[PDB]
Structure formats: C-alpha cells, structure tokens
Amino acid sequence: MKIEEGKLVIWINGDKGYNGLAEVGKKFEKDTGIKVTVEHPDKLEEKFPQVAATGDGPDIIFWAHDRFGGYAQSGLLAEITPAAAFQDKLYPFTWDAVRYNGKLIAYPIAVEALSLIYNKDLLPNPPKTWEEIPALDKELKAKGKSALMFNLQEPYFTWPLIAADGGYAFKYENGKYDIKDVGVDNAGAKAGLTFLVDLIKNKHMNADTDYSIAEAAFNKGETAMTINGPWAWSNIDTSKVNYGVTVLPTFKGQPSKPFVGVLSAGINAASPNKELAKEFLENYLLTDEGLEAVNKDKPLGAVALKSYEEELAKDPRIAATMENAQKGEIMPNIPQMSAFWYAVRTAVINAASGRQTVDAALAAAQTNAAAKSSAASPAALSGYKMTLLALIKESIPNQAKRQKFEMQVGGIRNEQDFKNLRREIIRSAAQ
Ligand SMILES: OC[C@H]1O[C@H](O[C@H]2[C@H](O)[C@@H](O)[C@@H](O)O[C@@H]2CO)[C@H](O)[C@@H](O)[C@@H]1O
C-alpha cells in the first residue's frame, strides 16, 4: 500500500505511550485537519526495515537510536532539517545520538536507562551488589516470594551485567567503532553471563521469564525487585506497590553498565508528508504539552526537551535513571548493531537454558556479531562509490530520492552491492 499523502501514520513500540501520542495526533488534526494514526505493530524494529525497503510504511518511525544507522544506510530515512533555534531547545548529548556520518537522521525524544526497581515493603534497603542477591532470594523464598525477576528474553536487560566487568559491543577508540573487535567473549562478559546463568541454575531466576511474566510478578508483589525502564512505572503506579527506583547493583566491585537508548523519531525517506512530519515532531510533540501527554501515558524517561525536563528531573526516579545512564554508555548507532544484538540475544537464551555452556554461547556470539559479507579492495570500493554518487547527482531529479540513494552508497561493501544499487538508481522513474 502506498503511503497516503495528507495523513501521518506513526509507528511506536507497544511498551511506549502510544495513547498519549495519539492525543498529540488529535491536536495536530484539530489545527491542520490532517489525520494522525498511531500504531504499535509487533516486532517493530524488524517490521519497519522490511516494509520501508519496499518504499512503503509509516511516515514516522520511533525506536531507540541504536537501530537508526542501519535504517539510514538502507535508504529508509530522510535527512531532517531542524533550524538551529529548534536544536537549541534539546540537550546536545541527545542530538549526538541521532547523528550518523556527519548528518542528523532523527529527532531525539527521551533518554532511557534501566534501573533497579524494588518493593519497599518487601525490601526497605535494595542490594548494592549482584553477589548478595542469592542470599536475599533465600530469605524471600522462605516467605513464599522471591528476590528478582526481569526479562531474560531480550539481551538489553542482561547487558548491564555482561558489561559490568568488561564486556563490550565494539571497541571504541579515537571516536570510531572497530566492527572487527567485538567484546562479548572476553573475561568480563564471561563472568557476567556466568553470574546470570548461576542465578538460574541455583533457582533464583527462571530462564523462561519474559517481560510480561516479570512485570506481573513485581506488580502483584510476588518478587521484591525487577529491572526495567521508565515506561514500566505507569503500571507499577496502578498496582499501588510501594516501590523505589535506584542504581543497578555492582558486579565484581564494578558498576553495572546499561546500554542507554535515546527514543528517536525518524521520517521515512519515502514519505510524501515530510513537512507535515517535521511540523508534528517539532511543533506538537517536542513541546511541554506534547511530551506531557505522552509521559502521562507511559513515562518517557529524561526527555530531550530542556523546558520540560527541568520539571521531570526533580523526580528521584529520573535522578536514578540518569545515575544509571552515567555509569553506562549511549549505544552506538552504527549498522552493525543489529548483528550485535542478534548475537547476544542468541547467546543469553542458549546459555540461560542450561543446554549450552557460557563459553560456547559467547564464542559463537563473538563470531556472529562480527559476521559480514565479502569486501571489495579499498581502491575498487572507492571507485564504485564515486561512480554512484556522480550518477545520483546527474540522474535522480527528486531530492529525497537523491538523499536516500547517497546514504545507500555509504553501505556498499563490494561489487555485487555496487551493481544492485546501480540497478535501483537506473530503474528509478518520475516521482
Ligand atoms: O534486547 C535488545 C534490544 O535492546 C534495545 O531495545 C529496548 C528499547 O531500547 C527500549 O525502548 C525498550 O522498549 O525495550 C527494548 C528491549 O526489549 C535496543 O534498542 C534494540 O535495538 C535491541 O534489539
């Protein structure tokens, strides 16, 4: 289905404040007459690239920033054009998360970091260390409860522990990521995953626990602690559990190092509604009133808009969010992040199951994370890229098409990639 002109379709994850976003959409419609439809499809981070590659999909995509370099390199994202005066309204550290190869590729919305969330009735003082959690579990088990439940199906939640004593995604030096140097199989990563697997082997956690199961257990007062982000606070408030949000536990005397996400909004390169999307994002969503509507539905975290974050940062739950963020890393946004996350997802699930050792799981993850296709020689690759750039500038009269094709040129790695992109450019017809 072609993207409808004179309408905005927005995709956002189902754990986010989509109903509040729809309220901002209602205001946009009141003022402009343009309908805004918000959807939250399953497997969004996969659905978007698959559908947008066909030239279709939502006008606006929301996800954490880590996936956006890959979307941009695939030609799925428009270059955004915020004026300096608009840029000044948002924190510089959030703009840096949505810059790729020298250009802005999305609008930053809010900073997400995992925290330890604990039930103050069950546990007045939260543990400072991971190592003390088995003993805590033993006492809570005696009471028919447990110490800790969190999602073991998404490696986002386990990463802070894997990273604590030295695990890393890609080596980051001189401001550049070396995609051949993956750190998921070093001593630190092994130690962190081993600790997780031991918690499971010793019946302090269950490998099958997912988002829904952990949330229900915490929100029904069955488990003393969970690990989650700001979006989860709404449902805890509803449950009336008396909870705190705090610094993650240390492991081997090192802070846990969560990978920090910036919820970001990109504009589909194929959208015929780029100006409407800019108007909605800049002048409806990224305002005190817009962010309040979304935040009241599900908390966004530490919002990128200075004027509204001034108020939200009073909250100790936001202070704890940023305490954790400061101990972790803003995620890379490079295209290889998808392969990294696949590799670690697989390793955590397989090791947690008890059917594969940690060392075997992480050895495979190291190989899986760095996997890439054949490379042309550097000389040949530069010649292909320069050919395509000149071809695009000569032959593609539509600006958005030129801009997306030039981003695609950045991702070619070999002669086959060159030939395929050449075919895409030559086949292009009147817009
Ligand atoms: O588990 C890997 C997954 O981690 C991150 O996804 C987070 C997302 O950032 C949060 O906004 C929240 O929704 O939970 C997700 C984990 O289920 C990465 O952003 C994502 O790319 C990656 O696959």
> What is the Cα–Cα distance from 327 to 100, expressed in whole angstroms?
24
Containing H/E element for 380? helix 378-395
159 lines ligand 1 (CB under 6 A): no
State whether residue 59 is helix, strand or coil. Answer: coil
Among residues 169, 316, 326, 320, the alpha carbon closest in space to that of 255 is found at: 326
Amino acid identity at 57: G
The Å distance, Cα 402 to ligand 1 centre, comes to 31
Whether the Cβ atoms of residue 260 and residue 156 lie closer than 8 Å to each other: no
Structural domain of 120: 115-259+335-366
Whether the Cβ atoms of residue 398 and residue 78 lie closer than 8 Å to each other: no
> What is the Cα–Cα distance from 10 to 27, expressed in whole angstroms?
15
66 lines ligand 1 (CB under 6 A): yes
Whether the Cβ atoms of residue 414 and residue 373 lie closer than 8 Å to each other: yes
45 lines ligand 1 (CB under 6 A): yes
State whether residue 173 is helix, strand or coil. Answer: strand
CB-count burial class (<10 Å; 0-12, 13-18, 19+) for 253: exposed
Classify the phi-psi angles of 28: left when phi > 0, otherwise alpha if psi is within -120 to 50, otherwise beta. Answer: alpha
Report residue 56 as tokens: 């279709």
Show the beta-strand stretches assigned E in 60-184. Answer: 60-64, 99-100, 103-104, 107-112, 115-119, 146-148, 168-173, 176-183
Among protein residues, the one with the nearest Cα to ligand 1's atom 10 is: 64
Rg (CA), the chain: 23
State whether residue 362 is helix, strand or coil. Answer: helix
Whether the Cβ atoms of residue 261 and residue 331 lie closer than 8 Å to each other: yes
Report residue 152 as tokens: 């073991």
The Å distance, Cα 41 to ligand 1 centre, comes to 15
Whether the Cβ atoms of residue 94 and residue 325 lie closer than 8 Å to each other: no
Indicate the DSSP class of residue 203: T
Containing H/E element for 292? helix 288-297
Cα separations (Å) of 176 from 100, 118, 132, 413? 12, 37, 37, 18
In sequence order, what are the residues at sequence separation of 6 or more whose Cβ sits closer than 8 angstroms to the Cβ of residue 330?
65, 93, 96, 97, 260, 262
Cβ neighbours, 10 Å, residue 184: 30
Amino acid identity at 64: A
Among residues 203, 109, 213, the alpha carbon closest in space to that of 157 is found at: 213
Among residues 218, 228, 281, the alpha carbon closest in space to that of 24 is found at: 281
Among protein residues, the one with the nearest Cα to ligand 1's atom 14 is: 156
Whether the Cβ atoms of residue 86 and residue 108 lie closer than 8 Å to each other: no
The Å distance, Cα 78 to ligand 1 centre, comes to 22
The Å distance, Cα 421 to ligand 1 centre, comes to 30
Cα separations (Å) of 354 from 122, 198, 205, 324, 343? 30, 9, 12, 30, 17
Q: How far apart are the first and last CA of the chain?
A: 16
CATH number at 216 reads 3.40.190.10
Whether the Cβ atoms of residue 152 and residue 348 lie closer than 8 Å to each other: yes
The Å distance, Cα 270 to ligand 1 centre, comes to 25
What torsion, rounded to 10 degrees, do the Cα atoms 236, 237, 242, 248 define? 50
Report residue 54 as tokens: 């066909």
Cβ neighbours, 10 Å, residue 180: 10
> What is the Cα–Cα distance from 149 to 160, expressed in whole angstroms?
15
> What is the Cα–Cα distance from 36 to 24, expressed in whole angstroms?
9
Among residues 346, 308, 315, 185, the alpha carbon closest in space to that of 244 is found at: 315
15 lines ligand 1 (CB under 6 A): yes
The Å distance, Cα 64 to ligand 1 centre, comes to 7
CA angle at residue 317 from 315 to 319, to 5 degrees? 75
State whether residue 10 is helix, strand or coil. Answer: strand
154 lines ligand 1 (CB under 6 A): yes
Q: Which residue has the tokens 């490079």?
A: 334
CB-count burial class (<10 Å; 0-12, 13-18, 19+) for 125: exposed
Amino acid identity at 53: A
CB-count burial class (<10 Å; 0-12, 13-18, 19+) for 269: buried
Containing H/E element for 39? strand 36-39
The Å distance, Cα 125 to ligand 1 centre, comes to 29
279 lines ligand 1 (CB under 6 A): no
261 lines ligand 1 (CB under 6 A): yes
**Reported resolution, Å:** 1.3
CA angle at residue 337 from 414 to 259, to 5 degrees? 160
17 lines ligand 1 (CB under 6 A): no
Experimental method used, please? X-ray
Beta bridge partners of 62: 265
Cα separations (Å) of 60 from 22, 56, 297? 13, 11, 20
Amino acid identity at 73: Q
Among protein residues, the one with the nearest Cα to ligand 1's atom 6 is: 156
Whether the Cβ atoms of residue 339 and residue 179 lie closer than 8 Å to each other: no
The Å distance, Cα 179 to ligand 1 centre, comes to 20
Classify the phi-psi angles of 364: left when phi > 0, otherwise alpha if psi is within -120 to 50, otherwise beta. Answer: alpha
The number of C-alpha atoms within 13 Å of 150 and in the hemisphere containing its C-beta is 25
64 lines ligand 1 (CB under 6 A): yes
Cβ neighbours, 10 Å, residue 122: 20
341 lines ligand 1 (CB under 6 A): yes
107 lines ligand 1 (CB under 6 A): no
Whether the Cβ atoms of residue 246 and residue 116 lie closer than 8 Å to each other: yes
Among protein residues, the one with the nearest Cα to ligand 1's atom 2 is: 156
Among protein residues, the one with the nearest Cα to ligand 1's atom 15 is: 156
User: Which one of 154, 298, 329, 334 would you pick to mutate in the ligand 1 pocket, going by the greatest count of ligand atoms within 8 A of its CB?
Assistant: 154
> What is the Cα–Cα distance from 360 to 362, expressed in whole angstroms?
6
